[PDB]
């Protein structure tokens, strides 16, 4: 169980694939216009604001976090987030992230 | 004349290269329903004349996890063709995130 989304540098949902109402709850207009940290457990906040913050270090490469999620129901699930930063080489816009978030065990 | 975001769709295929999501802008850019492309390999797309390049660079896919394209042409849903480019970016492997930007009109 997974779902899409597209994010600025600062964290803040920009795109959010449907499937997030099966993955965390949530109408994808829940989410845009937040930032991914404002449904992240409070020990979790701070790795999550640094993988953001690294993520367009990594040259274009897979960063991964794990964290909690806060539900629609606010209960903590487990997520995995795959990130990637996207810039189109035929302009120099501000690049932004894609990531894919899926629910997963801590096990 | 488009700005950059409305020439570029993600896409998410399984690692048989079936499309697993699309961003519903390629609707206005290829003619495609995101709903009718799921469990459709991308091969079913690609002009013949590109199959052979495609088939080596999934292969780069497969082994580097992250390729670009270079030009190739999709199918357009009311036949012609697209000039397309793609980032590729494997998720470990459990899918593949394809950003997807659009270079010609249908032809
Ligand atoms: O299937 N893919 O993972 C994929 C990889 C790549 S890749 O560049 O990583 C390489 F494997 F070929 C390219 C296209 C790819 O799929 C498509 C996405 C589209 F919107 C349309 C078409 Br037709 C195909």
Redesign the pocket.
């Known amino acids: 169980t997974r779902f899409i989304s597209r994010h600025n540098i600062e964290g803040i949902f920009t795109f959010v694939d449907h499937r997030c109402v099966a993955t965390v709850g949530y109408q994808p207009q829940e989410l845009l216009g937040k930032n991914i940290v404002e449904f992240c457990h409070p020990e979790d906040q701070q790795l999550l604001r640094d993988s953001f913050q690294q993520v367009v270090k990594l040259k274009g490469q897979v960063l991964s976090v794990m964290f909690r999620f806060r539900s629609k129901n606010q209960e903590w699930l487990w997520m995995r987030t795959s990130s990637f930063t996207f810039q189109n080489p035929y302009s120099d816009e501000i690049e932004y992230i894609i990531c894919t978030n899926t629910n997963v065990k801590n096990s | 004349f488009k700005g950059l975001d409305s020439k570029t769709?993600l896409?998410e295929?399984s690692m048989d290269?079936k499309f697993t999501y699309?961003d519903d802008r390629?609707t206005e850019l290829i003619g495609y329903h995101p709903e009718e492309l799921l469990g459709r390999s991308?091969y079913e797309?690609?002009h013949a004349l590109d199959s052979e390049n495609?088939t080596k660079?999934?292969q780069n896919?497969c082994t580097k996890g992250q390729?670009?394209?270079g030009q190739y042409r999709?199918l357009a849903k009311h036949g012609g063709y697209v000039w397309?480019e793609?980032?590729?970016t494997v998720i470990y492997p459990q899918c593949?995130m394809?950003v997807?930007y659009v270079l010609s009109e249908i032809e």
């Open positions: 769709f896409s295929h290269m699309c390629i991308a797309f690609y495609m660079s999934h896919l390729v670009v394209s999709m397309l793609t980032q590729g593949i394809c997807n």
